[PDB]
Design a protein around this ligand. Structure first.
Ligand SMILES: CCCc1c(C(=O)Nc2cc(S(=O)(=O)N(C)C)ccc2C)cnn1-c1ccccc1
Lengths: 345, 346
């Protein structure tokens, strides 16, 4: 029910040259509303069929405290481009793991990782309840509101957001034939299931300070030939609860359908009764502090591995072979004609 | 040359003005653009943090030297490499330009029901591309459905040369992605003599014919179970070739099973497609079919042309196994950026 105001942004707001970080498709600028003196941020988000459906979804998720609040969206022209000017709540707390990065003396406890995951879960539970399947939930998209400890973790980066069908999968049976039956295409099954996949990774990162995948691999939960106990190595996973160590197994299940849902994750005892959670100390604060340079690569491989858990609906369909043509196709088909004329004489 | 600044992908881009309409792609720092000097629509990749560690600086020089030598219609081919820096003192950024494609197999499998004629031409160019890359001594090591870009019509190009090297007797173990890796890697340490990618296409070839994963190994150990379930447990003739002792005891712990006829698992598949899969999924690495022999298979009688399957000039190592300072790899990368001669679009 959002109405995009069509009037110039400078009539209500004051745009400054102060940069609030570089986005993916433009620059983020500081912006104030004169009638409220309220500081905000500004997103360019060039107009297109993709941009208007995203803002339509990020608008609906605004009434959720763990999701950044869209304040209003304009449709103006900047640099001769048809743009959808987006104004947002200014997030100053920084990245979620940068707050855990700099920790003075108080050690990270497993309980502290519970309300953090309960916070992220409340955002995914809201999005899935209204059938918007965010599929870019990663550390750099989890910003706090302020440097003050009273900050609230929020979800951002709705670039890959998607409205999906609320069709619970019918949960494949235990009895399967020897042969592999031809798969029925159900690409929407990767929409919600990709969300929970990020939940297990984030939950895994929090407890040990590093991701499951060693390198050019994925979701495998090793520079030597390990035969067992590779799932949660003991040097940092020793004092972790068994109920928690097995929840990550459900969230990082290789199968999208058999993966744990968001209704179950929010109803799990470690998330439901988060108050009576063990206070065991962790090694996140120290593991992240051990190498800041490796942490940036952690953000890179997670983004690349995220593409395998999601479906790029904005990609072409391969045409039927007879309807397509390319240099190599005609190089073979024109050669086929040469034998015909050669057979004549 | 003259560049123009532009903020994209959380960084600042200054590329030559011959590339206009720079637009992001997604997860992928790559940008889709239009090349004015060639009239084509190309993609420009920005290497984020190319020189931060000895491994990163060394891998950038190793990677860039590989794209230079790749000259196929089924392998990714570097059209242009540049840098906004005028001299080495200000050299801290690099870019790469190549053809824009449109899709990759991984997203195609989860989106399209591929036909038998699709697999014939898709796998053909992989093997035709496999012949080139293997002509020069090299192992791709990362063949998987997410590394084979596919255009709108039918053209595909191999990608991701990040982990590839001139074949040697001993080399880094645990390399390929498991679901598309050979059983040689964990069984034998310095094994995998240019056969994982052939084994990987066999995994990829069954991906297109089915739509699901052949070997979706949950853990490292579960991979050995799902593989040996289809290819059968190795006999004592082959069980002596195993390197590790703790591994040999594991293989001897499963219920012993033989190879099943692959035509019993792939229902409705082409008997020639199954016949090729039987040759690409042999436990004996020395007996598995090669890419040069795979093109002569009757599965590609519609597209096989022995006069249009070119080979490579051998690529020598020349610095790839040395260990130098960060600045040395940055200069060695620089020497190969200016020495790049773009090819004419005949
Ligand atoms: C990550 C794929 C991006 C992509 C490409 C690409 O990545 N090209 C590319 C590769 C290397 S690389 O092989 O050396 N490598 C990955 C490191 C180096 C430089 C470019 C410029 C092509 N199409 N899409 C593409 C995919 C889907 C839709 C539209 C386009």
């Amino acid at each position: 029910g959002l109405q995009i105001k069509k009037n110039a942004i400078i009539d209500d707001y004051k745009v400054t040259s102060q940069v609030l970080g570089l986005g993916i498709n433009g620059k983020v600028l500081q912006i104030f509303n004169k009638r409220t003196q309220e500081k905000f941020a500004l997103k360019m988000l060039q107009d297109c069929p993709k941009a208007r459906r995203e803002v339509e979804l990020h608008w609906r998720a605004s009434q959720c405290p763990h999701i950044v609040r869209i304040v209003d969206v304009y449709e103006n022209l900047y640099a001769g481009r048809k743009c959808l000017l987006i104004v947002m709540e200014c997030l100053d707390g920084g990245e979620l793991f940068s707050r855990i990065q700099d920790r003075g003396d108080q050690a990270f406890t497993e309980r502290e990782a519970s309300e953090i995951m309960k916070s992220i879960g409340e955002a995914i539970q809201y999005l899935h309840s209204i059938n918007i399947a965010h599929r870019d939930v990663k550390p750099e998209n989890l910003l706090y509101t302020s440097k003050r400890p009273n900050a609230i973790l929020k979800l951002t980066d709705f670039g890959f957001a998607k409205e999906t069908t609320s069709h619970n999968s019918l949960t494949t049976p235990c009895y399967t034939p020897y042969y592999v039956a031809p798969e029925v295409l159900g690409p929407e099954k990767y929409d919600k299931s990709c969300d929970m996949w990020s939940l297990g990774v984030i939950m895994y990162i929090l407890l040990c300070g590093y991701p499951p995948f060693y390198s050019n691999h994925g979701l495998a939960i090793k520079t030597r030939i390990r035969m067992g106990q590779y799932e949660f190595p003991n040097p940092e996973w020793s004092e972790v609860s068994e109920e928690v160590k097995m929840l990550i197994r459900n969230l990082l299940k290789t199968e999208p359908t058999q993966r744990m849902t968001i209704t179950e994750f929010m109803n799990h005892p470690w998330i439901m009764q988060s108050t009576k959670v063990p206070q065991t100390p962790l090694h996140t604060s120290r593991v992240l502090k051990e190498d800041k340079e490796r942490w940036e690569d952690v953000k890179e491989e997670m983004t690349s591995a995220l593409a395998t858990m999601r479906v790029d609906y904005e990609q072409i369909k391969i045409k039927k072979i007879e309807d397509a043509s390319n240099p190599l196709l005609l190089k073979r088909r024109k050669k086929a004609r040469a034998l015909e004329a050669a057979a004549l004489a | 040359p003259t560049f123009y600044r532009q903020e994209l992908n959380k960084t600042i881009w200054e590329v030559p003005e011959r590339y206009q309409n720079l637009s992001p792609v997604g997860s992928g720092s790559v940008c889709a653009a239009f090349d004015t000097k060639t009239g084509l629509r190309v993609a420009v990749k920005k290497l984020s943090r190319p020189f931060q560690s000895i491994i990163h600086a060394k891998r950038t020089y190793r990677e860039l030297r590989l794209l230079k030598h790749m000259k196929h219609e089924n392998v990714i081919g570097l059209l242009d490499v540049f840098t906004p820096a005028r001299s080495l003192e200000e050299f801290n950024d690099v870019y790469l330009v190549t053809h824009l494609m449109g899709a990759d197999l991984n997203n195609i499998v989860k989106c399209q029901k591929l036909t038998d004629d699709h697999v014939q031409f898709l796998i053909y160019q992989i093997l035709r591309g496999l012949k080139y890359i293997h002509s020069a001594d090299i192992i791709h090591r990362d063949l998987k459905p997410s590394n084979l870009a596919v255009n709108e019509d039918c053209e595909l190009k191999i990608l991701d040369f990040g982990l590839a090297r001139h074949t040697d007797d001993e080399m880094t173990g645990y390399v390929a992605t498991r679901w598309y890796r050979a059983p040689e890697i964990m069984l034998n340490w310095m094994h995998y003599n240019q056969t994982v990618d052939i084994w990987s296409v066999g995994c990829i070839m069954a991906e297109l014919l089915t739509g699901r994963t052949l070997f979706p190994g949950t853990d490292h150990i579960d991979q050995l179970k799902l593989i040996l379930r289809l290819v059968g447990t190795p006999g004592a003739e082959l069980l002596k070739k195993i390197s590790s002792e703790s591994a040999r005891n594991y293989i001897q712990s499963l219920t012993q099973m033989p190879k099943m006829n692959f035509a019993n698992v792939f229902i409705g598949a082409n008997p020639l497609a199954v016949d090729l899969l039987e040759k690409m999924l042999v436990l004996d690495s020395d007996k598995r079919i090669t890419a040069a022999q795979a093109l002569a298979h009757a599965y590609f009688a519609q597209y096989h042309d022995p006069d249009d399957e070119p080979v490579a000039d051998p690529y020598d190592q020349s610095f790839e196994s040395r260990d130098l300072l960060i600045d040395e790899w940055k200069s060695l990368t620089y020497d190969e950026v200016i020495s790049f001669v773009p090819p004419p679009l005949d």
